[PDB]
Each structure stands twice: as structure tokens, then as C-alpha cells.
Design a protein around this ligand. Structure first.
Ligand code: OAW
Length: 841
């Protein structure tokens, strides 16, 4: 079929990698997974409601918060229905269904209610208070604008036509030798690993370091063939003592067969603990990489793989073990305790990650007992889903499919709003899966095909990894292709325009970067005008905001910015004529910063805002849109009406460390029309400042430069450029005299706003502390999947101190107030030093 072959070249263009390309494979796992996923894909496409899928209603089950309830008139919401040039406002009870909001339009004085200017529809049996746009409208005090129109054709989402246990011998590997085409002493270290657990360790004799070093040794391991668990790795490492190269091979394949034969595995080098050290993929660059030659006995061959009481002090020992943070290491005593009292540990879902890390995986009867333990899962299965507990079972410490599957089972019960909250980190969690085909990969795939919004983000999350990870590109490319073959031609067409546009805008960014002024300013418009001609589509969906349709460029407004990395400031017209405003879509296109790092941080800010929403706290964070498109390249959402803290100083001062305290509050009044607005801008400042002080403190990205703190003309403060301190790594946070001056404090003093501040801080900080485990795991996972070199295990443990684990609320309240005071003690010291360092040298 030729129309099927041309379609593969389109998929290959959308993916950014050729999924058929067999040059970098040593087995059919990727083919077996491409084939393996055909069923979940066909089962979700067939099960989905075409109408609900066509319109992707964005709904939450969460109770409407208090701060949103108080903003109500009196059990009444004002919805402004539009049409052509007619606009009739209707009073509607928060509990009112959008179907009845038509019955209160066709009887009060077939057709769908779409938001004005957005591809966002208010459909299905859900109270309007439960729509995410509605809740967004209440928060920002915006008006609920709806334009009545026709439901999209669900025929546009049309999808195109489609024994190991009996051999008691000790395991062995023959290390033939290693070869590097260019250029000491050298040894091969072979390890039998099961999720961070090293079952056995062998080494070769140190030979001289030459372009070809041979051994012909049979390395015998202490573990028997029968004791090998499904998920075990053979980790090959080259030392010279300094590690230089690594490669991994799964011992038991995707078919449950033990590994036999000859393998020439090309090796991954070491640059400069992370997820890339765990890859089953081989280095694609053959011409320059080091390879290892090995043999595994191709024998016959096919070897396939198939309560009482407790003393007070022991129970008190177990309880103190179970109620410990995810990062506290377990000692051999703790592990022996947990395992002996395993049936008692099962009644405590919180214990599962610690109980499963007590299992000796290099022992078959032990692993068999662990399966008996999982058949008595009841408590876990019954319990109210805990994400932080679920994620602990998806980390690098778990290599058993069955242990991992119980966490994926817990995720099935997540509503879409929640899937979107944890999507970026569930996608990064795929890097920890022993096999390409997993319960997690299938989960991600089902959810994306079931919802266009999860699907839009899945695509960019996966695309970003395929574009910049050689260790994971193959695995991700197989999940992307599986998604793209079940989303619809409408989605396929959407993704097409987006890729086409973003790929053009990346060329522009890099060409402009090369020339580094009057000369450059010209080239900008010169290049942008050629694109707007015909090749570039009329409009395109915004990758960080799928609800928006970005039309033609505002060439006039578009500019190259004054920075080391020369970024593009682009402006786009809203392609939707139903838009209640002529406000542009501002996007920054940048090369230099690692936007992967920003994304991970931005997503943690969203989770922190959600932890605050559950405890009636709105800390006014601005976690702006950010989509990494490739290596050190991607896009940033422009936050409107915003300046940097440094430029505000540069205004009433001028390119010096002479930092005036008066400056901020001045600019705030200068940019406020009424004093009612100024009071609210100060109210926003106090709230946003506490939020970034706490968040920044917890994440440990607190010591920042003024140039990386932004403020809106409406008082909202926000941090920018996270992939800069994390890109290349004192005060706990930025709480400068200009910030304290806005709060009504000069030197060591107190005011009604500074007391307001400290109370919000302590409330916010104690709210995050109730989610210790969750924040720890996320932080730990972000460091492993997204942070290069910033690992060690010690960088991870920073979060324990910040979250003040082990301490009580009163002691925690005390600890945060100290930090607030070290900010007052330092004043402008750190800022002036940052200016000295960054601006000068
Ligand atoms: C969210 C955001 N908004 C605005 N108005 N400007 C930004 C920005 N974000 C970044 C940024 C975020 N990560 N890296 C840069 C940025 O540099 N700027 C300017 C100073 C041009």
C-alpha cells in the first residue's frame, strides 16, 4: 500500500526519528513493542465517545475552592452568550449543566457553547463551576464569554485503516574484548543489576590501553541462572580509577527468554546517578564510539522463564521505618525487619516502597514469595490513591513489572485534570522502565487517545525527548508513533502545522544567533516576511496552550533581545475572530538555555499551587508556558505587562550596584491607575512574593539575580530562566529591601503587610510539608531525568533539609522565619555580588 508508505514519512516527520531504522538494534524489542501496542491503541480509539473526544471538555471533580466561592454574586454566575454582534448576559447557578444553559436560552427567550477566541467548548453533564475555564475566569476576575456555534464533526477525528528455574548453574559471560578507533591501563567491569541493586560483580584483569584490547575470559557470576529475575541488566563498564564507558543489556528478553549469542554493543561515554546510565539502547554513533564484544552460551538453547503477633519494641521499630521519608536509606537491619514482618507491612500502603526494596531479587524463592505477597494486595487496591506513593514505585529503584503494575493500577483511577498535573513526570518515568512495552507506556498511550489535551501535551513531551535524548529516542519514538496512529486526521493535521511552524522559527533563531545591532535588526523582518508568504500555514495551535490559535505575525513588534544568547521576541495575531480582544500571543524562541530543566520546575510550581488550592491558599504564582523543542532550544510564553526587577532599578538608578529601596513601590504606583488598583497590586505582590519565596526555597533555586525576577504592572511577581542556575551550578531566597519597602518596612521593622507576608509564608510552607513524600520523589525524579551532573545523591538530599523532615510544625514555623531574617541581614549584599559577578566579573 503506497498511501500507507507515504503516511510513514509523515509520521517520521512528526516524530523526528525513523522508527523503522534497524541500524541501532540488537533484537526485535522495538518491533515487538510497535506490534504490541496495536491492541491498546485500537481498543481506545474504538471505546472513545466521538462527540466528547471531538470537543475535549476540560473538567475537574475537585471542590470549587473557598477563594472562588467568595467571588460569587450570591449563588449566581454571569455568563455572556454571544453570536454575531448580539450579546445577552444570563444569571446561572454554579450547579447548572451546560445543556440546561441552552434550555434557559431556547425557552427563556443541536448547538454547542464554545469559549470566545478559544478552541474550548462547555459540554457534557457537568456543573459550569466544574469547568476549568470558568474557574480561571473567577480567579482573574474576567467575564465568562461564550459564543454559540455548531459541534465539530466527530468524523474529522477519523482514524486510518489498519525452563530458567531448572538450570542450577552459575551464570557466566565471555568478554572477548573492546575497541576505540582513536586515543594507559584498562578493565571491563560487568554487573548484574536489578533496579539500582547490584546482585553480582566481576572484573577483567587490567590490560594496556590500546585501540583494541582482548581478553577471551569467561566471567563467572555467583548467581545461578534460576536466580536471575525478569528485569535484570548486564551492566558493562570501562575503567582506566575512572569510569569512561557503559552499556546495558537485559538478561531476560521481552519474550521471557534468557539471552544467548554474540553481541557487539556500542558504548555510551561519560561527560562532565542519572536515568541515561540505565538505558537498554546502544550508542548510535558507530564511527567514533567504543564497543564491547561478548558471548552468552547459545546452549541447546531456548531457556524460557515461567502472619502472627509482634513485640511492642519491634512494632515501634517497624512503625518508625514505615513513617520515614522516601530518601531515608534503609539499613540491613531495617530490611530484615520489614521482610520478616511483611504481612504486617502490607496493611500499610505507605510501607510498599520500603517493603519492596527489602526483597532480595537475586533469589527465586524470595521473588516467588513476593508474588504470593502481591496476591494479598487488597489494602493497597482498596486505599485512596496517593500519587507520591505511586511515583515511588515508578522510580529507578523498582525493576519488577508486577510491583510497577500496582502503581500503574493506582494511576488508572486518576481523572484527566490530574493526568495533566503529573503528565510530564509520568513521561519522564518511562526512562525507568526495564522494557519498552510497559503498563506505564500503555497507560500514557490510552490517556492520550482518550483526551485531546493529554494527547497534545503527550506529543510535545515525547517529541522533546526524541529530539534531544539518544539514550531514549527509540523507546519514545515507538510510543509517539503508537499515539499518532490513533489520534485522528484532525489531530494529525494540527500536529503537522505546529511542527512546520516551530521548525521554521528554530532556523530563524539559530541564524540570528550566529551574527553576534542595526545590521541584525533588518535580517529579522527580512526572514520573517519570507515565511508569512505561503509555505507557513495561515494559523497554528499554540504548543504550550492548545486552546489558542496563533495567526499571522506582528512583524513590527518582533525583535532580537539584548542577551549573550540572542533570543527572539515574537508576536502573533489571534487567528480566532471570536476573540473578545486584539491582544497578541507573545512567544520567545531561544537557543542556549536547557528548557527541559525549566519545564520540570514549571510543572512542580503547578503541583505546589495545587497543594495550596486544597488548603484554601492562592499564592499567585505565574508558572509561564514552556515547551523544549530540541537541544538547549525551544519556546517560552511571554507574560504580558512585565518587566525585570533589574531594569526597574536601571530606570531610577542606571547600570550600577547603587540599589535604591524606594524604586519598586514607585514603579508600582507609577503603573497603577487608581489607588484601589495599587492596594490590590500590593496585595498581589505580598501573596506572589511569599509563594515564590517558599517554592524557590523548597526547590533550592532561591539564590537568584534581579534580572531573573520579574513583576507585572499588576503587582504579580514571578521567577524566570530556571535552566540557568541548574544549567551550571548566600541567601535562602530573594526578599530585597525594595520588596520589604513595598510591604511597609525600612530596616528591621514590622507592618500590617509584613505580618501578612510571614503568615502566608508559614501557612504555604506548612501546607507543602504535609506533602513531604510527594515533593521529595518529584524533586528526586526531576534531578535524575532532567538535571545533568546535578545528581551525586547529595544534591537530592537538599529537599529533606528544606522541608525540615523529622521536625514538628512549631519548629518548622520557627525555621522558615529564620530564613526570612537572613534575607533582612543580607539586604543588598548578595544582589550586589550577583551584579559584580554576572554584569562585571
Ligand atoms: C515568562 C516571561 N515573560 C516575559 N515578559 N519576559 C520573559 C519571560 N521569560 C523569560 C525566560 C524564561 N526562561 N528563560 C527566559 C525571559 O527571558 N523574559 C524576558 C526577560 C525577555
Amino acid at each position: 500500500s503506497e498511501e500507507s508508505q507515504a503516511f510513514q514519512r509523515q509520521l517520521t516527520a512528526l516524530i523526528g526519528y525513523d522508527v523503522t531504522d534497524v541500524s541501532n538494534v540488537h533484537d526485535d524489542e522495538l518491533e515487538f513493542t510497535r506490534r504490541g501496542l496495536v491492541t491498546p491503541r485500537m481498543a481506545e480509539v474504538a471505546s472513545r465517545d466521538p462527540k466528547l473526544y471531538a470537543m475535549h471538555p476540560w473538567v475537574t471533580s475537585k471542590p470549587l475552592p473557598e477563594y472562588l466561592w467568595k467571588k460569587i454574586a450570591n449563588n449566581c454566575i454571569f455568563i455572556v452568550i454571544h453570536r454575531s454582534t448580539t450579546s445577552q448576559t444570563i444569571k446561572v447557578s454554579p450547579d447548572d449543566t451546560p445543556g440546561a444553559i441552552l434550555q434557559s436560552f431556547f425557552t427563556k427567550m443541536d448547538f454547542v457553547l464554545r469559549v470566545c477566541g478559544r478552541d474550548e467548548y462547555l459540554v457534557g453533564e457537568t456543573p459550569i463551576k466544574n469547568f476549568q475555564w470558568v474557574r480561571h475566569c473567577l480567579k482573574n476576575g474576567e467575564e465568562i464569554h461564550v459564543v454559540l456555534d455548531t459541534p465539530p464533526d466527530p468524523a474529522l477525528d477519523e482514524v486510518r485503516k489498519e525452563s530458567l528455574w531448572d538450570c542450577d548453574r552459575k551464570f557466566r559471560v565471555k568478554i572477548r574484548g573492546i575497541d576505540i578507533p582513536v586515543l594507559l591501563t584498562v578493565f571491563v567491569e560487568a554487573n548484574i543489576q536489578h533496579g539500582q541493586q547490584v546482585l553480582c560483580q566481576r572484573r577483567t584483569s587490567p590490560k594496556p590501553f590500546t585501540e583494541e584490547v582482548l581478553w577471551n575470559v569467561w566471567l563467572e557470576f555467583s548467581i545461578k541462572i534460576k536466580d536471575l529475575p525478569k528485569g535484570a541488566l548486564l551492566n558493562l563498564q570501562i575503567y582506566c580509577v575512572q569510569l569512561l564507558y557503559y552499556v546495558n543489556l537485559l538478561l531476560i528478553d521481552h519474550r521471557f527468554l534468557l539471552r544467548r549469542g554474540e553481541y557487539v554493543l556500542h558504548m555510551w561515554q561519560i561527560s562532565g546517578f542519572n536515568a541515561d546510565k540505565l538505558t537498554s539502547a546502544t550508542n548510535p554513533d558507530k564511527e567514533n564510539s567504543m564497543s564491547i564484544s561478548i558471548l552468552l552460551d547459545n546452549y541447546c538453547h531456548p531457556i524460557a522463564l515461567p502472619r502472627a503477633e509482634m513485640p511492642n519494641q519491634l512494632r515501634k521499630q517497624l512503625e518508625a521505618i514505615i513513617a520515614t521519608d522516601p530518601l531515608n536509606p534503609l539499613t540491613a537491619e531495617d530490611k530484615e525487619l520489614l521482610w520478616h514482618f511483611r504481612y504486617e507491612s502490607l496493611k500499610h500502603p505507605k510501607a510498599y516502597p520500603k517493603l519492596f526494596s527489602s526483597v532480595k531479587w537475586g533469589q527465586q524463592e524470595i521473588v516467588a514469595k513476593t508474588y504470593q505477597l502481591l496476591a494479598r494486595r487488597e489494602v493497597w487496591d482498596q486505599s485512596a490513591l496517593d500519587v507520591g506513593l505511586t511515583m515511588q514505585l515508578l522510580d529507578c529503584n523498582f525493576s519488577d513489572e508486577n510491583v510497577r503494575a500496582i502503581a500503574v493500577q493506582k494511576l488508572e483511577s486518576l481523572e484527566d485534570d490530574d493526568v495533566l498535573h503529573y503528565l510530564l513526570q509520568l513521561v519522564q518515568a518511562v526512562k525507568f522502565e526495564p522494557y519498552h512495552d510497559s503498563a506505564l507506556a500503555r497507560f500514557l498511550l490510552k490517556r492520550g487517545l482518550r483526551n485531546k489535551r493529554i494527547g497534545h501535551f503527550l506529543f510535545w513531551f515525547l517529541r522533546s525527548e526524541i529530539a534531544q535524548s539518544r539514550h531514549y529516542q527509540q523507546r519514545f519514538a515507538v510510543i509517539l508513533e503508537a499515539y499518532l496512529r490513533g489520534c485522528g486526521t484532525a489531530m494529525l493535521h494540527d500536529f503537522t502545522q505546529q511542527v512546520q511552524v516551530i521548525e521554521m522559527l528554530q532556523k530563524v533563531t539559530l541564524d540570528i544567533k550566529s551574527l553576534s545591532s542595526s545590521q541584525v535588526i533588518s535580517q529579522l523582518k527580512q526572514k520573517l516576511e519570507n515565511l508569512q508568504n505561503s509555505q507557513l500555514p495561515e494559523s497554528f495551535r499554540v504548543p504550550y496552550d492548545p486552546g489558542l490559535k496563533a495567526g499571522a505575525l506582528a512583524i513590527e513588534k518582533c525583535k532580537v533581545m539584548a542577551s549573550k544568547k540572542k533570543p527572539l521576541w515574537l508576536e502573533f495575531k489571534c487567528a480566532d475572530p471570536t476573540a473578545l480582544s486584539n491582544e497578541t500571543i507573545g512567544i520567545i524562541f531561544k537557543h542556549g538555555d536547557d528548557l527541559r530543566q525549566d519545564m520540570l520546575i514549571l510543572q512542580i510550581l503547578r503541583i505546589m499551587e495545587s497543594i495550596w488550592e486544597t488548603e484554601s491558599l492562592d499564592l499567585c504564582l505565574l508558572p509561564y508556558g514552556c515547551i523544549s523543542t530540541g537541544d538547549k532550544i525551544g519556546m517560552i510564553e511571554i507574560v504580558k505587562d512585565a518587566t525585570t526587577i533589574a531594569k526597574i532599578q536601571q530606570s531610577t538608578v542606571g547600570n550600577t550596584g547603587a540599589f535604591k529601596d524606594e524604586v519598586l513601590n514607585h514603579w508600582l504606583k507609577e503603573k497603577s491607575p487608581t489607588e484601589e488598583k495599587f492596594q490590590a497590586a500590593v496585595e498581589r505582590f505580598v501573596y506572589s512574593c511569599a509563594g515564590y519565596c517558599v517554592a524557590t526555597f523548597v526547590l533550592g533555586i532561591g539564590d537568584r539575580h534581579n534580572d531573573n525576577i520579574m513583576i507585572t504592572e499588576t503587582g504579580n511577581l514571578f521567577h524566570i530562566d530556571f535552566g540557568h542556575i541548574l544549567g551550571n551550578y548566600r541567601v535562602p531566597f530573594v526578599l530585597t529591601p525594595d520588596f520589604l519597602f513595598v510591604m511597609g518596612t525600612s530596616g528591621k521593622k514590622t507592618s500590617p503587610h509584613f505580618q501578612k507576608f510571614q503568615d502566608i509564608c508559614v501557612k504555604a510552607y506548612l501546607a507543602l510539608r504535609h506533602h513531604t513524600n510527594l515533593l521529595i520523589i518529584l524533586f528526586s525524579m526531576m534531578l535524575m531525568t532532567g538535571m545533568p551532573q546535578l545528581t551525586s545523591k547529595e544534591d537530592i538530599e537538599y529537599i529533606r533539609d528544606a522541608l525540615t523532615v523529622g521536625k514538628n510544625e512549631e519548629d518548622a514555623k520557627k525555621y522558615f522565619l529564620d530564613q526570612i531574617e537572613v534575607c533582612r541581614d543580607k539586604g543588598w549584599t548578595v544582589q550586589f555580588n550577583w551584579f559584580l559577578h554576572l554584569v562585571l566579573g
